[PDB]
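pasting for the record
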Amino acid sequence: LKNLNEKYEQLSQYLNQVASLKQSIQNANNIELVNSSLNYLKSFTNNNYNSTTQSPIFNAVQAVITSVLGFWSLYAGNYFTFFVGKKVDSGQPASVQGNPPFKTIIENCSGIENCAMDQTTYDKMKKLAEDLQAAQTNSATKGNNLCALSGCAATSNPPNSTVSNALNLAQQLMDLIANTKTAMMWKNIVISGVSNTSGAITSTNYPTQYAVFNNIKAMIPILQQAVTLSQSNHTLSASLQAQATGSQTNPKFAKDIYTFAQNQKQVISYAQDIFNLFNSIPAEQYKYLEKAYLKIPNAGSTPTNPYRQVVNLNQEVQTIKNNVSYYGNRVDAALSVARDVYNLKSNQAEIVTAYNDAKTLSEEISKLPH
């Protein structure tokens, strides 16, 4: 023992270093493997950028928008969790569809927080909510109104909103809600089989005190970031092509395929961040969000056009989780080959040092006393 065992551990590390350097160098020299990996990278970017059925980021956008309109549906919708009008305790109600009676403030808003909202502020929110709803769904066709990340097609009634336009409207709406010092009264929300059972949420507080609100709000800038990165990467893809045997040397291709692969991993990673934000929402709040379309008002007409899209929410969220695990593995493997292509030179120099270290150490050990 003593410093002998340590020398053996050290020799062991050196030789593992040689083996992995060897593998990496061999990978960079493996034209078929390099092209195979590039083809996967490009094929993912092509779907991500151009498709509305096979794009993980597009699907993520669908989930986030649906959840923003789902939250709006809970918070306001057909029966608000706040009172819109002038709060003289005497309250003068604005004549807006969904406004609860003023006695609701007395019943459900004891405690410092204010639960009323100025009509002009509500108007701004309602307008943003309507714009976001139109961006998502074509009222005429009842079909999808969001374009692939590549943009809207020129001119049969096609989708006419970019995902950036929808994300921007969502961002403004959530920002406005966060900044408005009006508390939401969850007890105003009536959903059969949910608000009348245990676990029901009945508390009153500013939206920024609820994880469902905060988490959904945080998804937007992350998704905006992901969208930009998907578009940069589609651009980068255009400058990368399958290599001729021996031409994967070119420093430019080396550095580009590596950047390409890192970026595409970051895209997947942003999608994972969004999945995590959905999965961090307390179960009971998520249940309210999923069922928001069943919300019924406690007074006046019971609307026949609630926000039903929320029924697709959970499937869309699970799709993010499946996309992440499926493409996550594959991009890791592609990224690995790209890193080796990029490090080929550096590795060739490093393996000579590591091999010599091992040869030396092995020889020292060979001469050590027994």
